[PDB]
Amino acid sequence: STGSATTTPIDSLDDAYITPVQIGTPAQTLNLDFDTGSSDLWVFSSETTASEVDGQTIYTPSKSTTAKLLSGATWSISYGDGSSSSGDVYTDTVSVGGLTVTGQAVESAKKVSSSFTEDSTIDGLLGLAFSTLNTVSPTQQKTFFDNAKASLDSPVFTADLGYHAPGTYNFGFIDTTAYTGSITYTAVSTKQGFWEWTSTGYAVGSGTFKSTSIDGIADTGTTLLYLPATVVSAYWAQVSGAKSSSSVGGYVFPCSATLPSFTFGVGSARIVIPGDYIDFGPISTGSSSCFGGIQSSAGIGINIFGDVALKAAFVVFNGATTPTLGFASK
Question: Residue 277 CB: number of other CB atoms within 10 A?
Fold first, then answer.
């Protein structure tokens, strides 16, 4: 089997992407944030504290003839940005882009933190990291991909995120029309539960490539590119007036600037992030200070190849017995 679904930016900055997901019988379609950096499929629901729901579409398990309470199961998750959610668990039928999994754990939120409430466009998350990170207790549950894998034509999914435009998540096949050149594959460590890999280096603009190993995670659920302070400083030094602002919470730059590109290495291959992808607009409405899309990972404890990086590539998440990651230009 295969599936194919369009993923759409939630706003004009590509702060996140939403993908429609069918849950239950008859189908209830929710727009979920596909997140290769976590492993829980959770949704706003009829059980979510009412004051914490503001415009999201909710899953109502009592209206699904295939929903079953997973007795005794609870979940609770905290994300790198400080947001969180928790609740109980149902199993139900879940379909993405024509690909159907029966008996999928659908984690129903009883509580969500303010950031989730405040974002009316995201109805929940669909985790695509390794199932070892799944938070359901006392019986850990499998991700949608893990459940689908054996049925897929090939044990892969691909992320093709757009810049200020829709893109595609495919399951079970590689669309050879969706990228240019060849796909370069690179080793993955699953030790921390992430799609963790090592970039071979970087360049700033038309500058020379610096060969250096950068361990990090491919994370569709993180907006920006978080890299070591040395790398980030070298990038922003090429932008007149750019500075790190403790009050704003990162590098800012004059909105009048033209940003240089940023290149990262995948083996001997190179992925080029155009400068415009690194512009996240005014820090506050009407400001002429703009927020940078490349930020320091210092104090995160891990480097993160978030959407800023991934949207410059066609990315293969290869879930074979020994997982790997592939990157192609597009």
Answer: 22
Tell me if the domain spanning 5-174 has CATH number 2.40.70.10. yes
Span 175-330 CATH architecture:
Beta Barrel (2.40)
Specify whether 199 is catalytic.
yes
* Domain range annotation of the chain: 5-174, 175-330
The upper half-sphere exposure of residue 3, i.e. CA atoms within 13 Å in the direction of its Cβ, equals: 27
| Residues comprising the chain, all counted | 330
Active-site residue (options: 45, 85, 199, 261): 199
Distance between alpha carbon 9 and the CA centroid of its chain, in Å? 12
DSSP states of 96-134 as a string?
ETTEEEEEEEEEEEEEE-HHHHT-TT--EEEE-S-GGG-
- Pick the catalytic residue: 14, 33, 35, 219? 35
Active-site residue 35, yes or no? Answer: yes
Burial 103-119 (b: 16+ CB within 10 A, else e): ebbbbbbbebbeebbeb
Q: Do domains 5-174 and 175-330 have the same CATH topology?
A: yes
Nearest by Cα to 161 from 3, 57, 305:
305
